[PDB]
Amino acid sequence: GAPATVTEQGEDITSKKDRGVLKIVKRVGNGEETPMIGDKVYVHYKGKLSNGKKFDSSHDRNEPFVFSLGKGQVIKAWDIGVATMKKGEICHLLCKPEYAYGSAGSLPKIPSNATLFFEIELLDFKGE
Ligand SMILES: COc1ccc(OCCN2CC[C@H]3CCC[C@@H](C2=O)N3S(=O)(=O)c2ccc3ncsc3c2)cc1OC
C-alpha cells in the first residue's frame, strides 16, 4: 500500500541524508514557490501508524491545520517536508521516529519509537 511504497520508493529530503524523512509527490502543485520560514501554512492531512491505524485527520474535523513553518510547532518531519511543497501539492511523507515523536511517543495514540505515514495537502501559505 501507500506506506510501503513511500518506504521503498520515496526520496530522502533530509539535510543529513539519513533517510529519516522520505517523500513522494502525489499531486503536483502550482508554480515553483515553496513557503518560507515563519509563514502561516494551511494544510489538510491524515496520519497512519505502522500498524495500519489512522491516528489523526484534519479532513474529519472539517478545518485545516494551521501552523507557522520552521518554528518547531510541529514534528521535525513536517517542518522539513512542508517546506518542500508547492501550493496545491499533495505528498506522502514517511517519518522515522527521530523526525517525529522519538522514544517518548505521544498519548493517546502514538507509541514509542513509531514510524509515521502522512498524506499532506498544502492548501495555502502566507507571510504575516
Ligand atoms: C518541537 O517538536 C515538536 C513539536 C510539536 C509536537 O507535537 C505537537 C504538534 N503536532 C500535533 C498536530 C498534528 C499535525 C502536525 C504534526 C503533528 C504535530 O507536530 N501532529 S500529529 O498528526 O503527528 C498528531 C500527534 C498526536 C496526536 N494525538 C491525538 S491526534 C494527534 C496527532 C511534537 C514535537 O516533538 C515531538
Swiss-Prot record:
PPIase FKBP-type domain residues: 30-118
The source's domain of life comes to Eukaryota
> What is the tissue specificity?
Widely expressed, enriched in testis compared to other tissues.
User: Its induction, per UniProt?
Assistant: By androgen.
Q: Where in the cell is it found?
A: Cytoplasm; Nucleus
Q: How is it modified after translation?
A: Acetylation impairs ability to promote interaction between Akt/AKT1 and PHLPP1. Deacetylation by SIRT7 promotes interaction between Akt/AKT1 and PHLPP1, leading to suppress Akt/AKT1 activation.
Q: What does this protein do?
A: Immunophilin protein with PPIase and co-chaperone activities. Component of unligated steroid receptors heterocomplexes through interaction with heat-shock protein 90 (HSP90). Plays a role in the intracellular trafficking of heterooligomeric forms of steroid hormone receptors maintaining the complex into the cytoplasm when unliganded. Acts as a regulator of Akt/AKT1 activity by promoting the interaction between Akt/AKT1 and PHLPP1, thereby enhancing dephosphorylation and subsequent activation of Akt/AKT1.
The record's note on quaternary structure and interaction partners says: Part of a heteromultimeric cytoplasmic complex with HSP90AA1, HSPA1A/HSPA1B and steroid receptors. Upon ligand binding dissociates from the complex and FKBP4 takes its place. Interacts with functionally mature heterooligomeric progesterone receptor complexes along with HSP90 and TEBP. Interacts with NR3C1. Interacts with Akt/AKT1 and PHLPP1; enhancing dephosphorylation and subsequent activation of Akt/AKT1. Interacts with IFI44L; this interaction modulates the kinase activity of IKBKB and IKBKE. Interacts with IKBKB and IKBKE.
Q: What is this protein called?
A: Peptidyl-prolyl cis-trans isomerase FKBP5
Give the residues of the full protein shown: 16 to 140 of 457
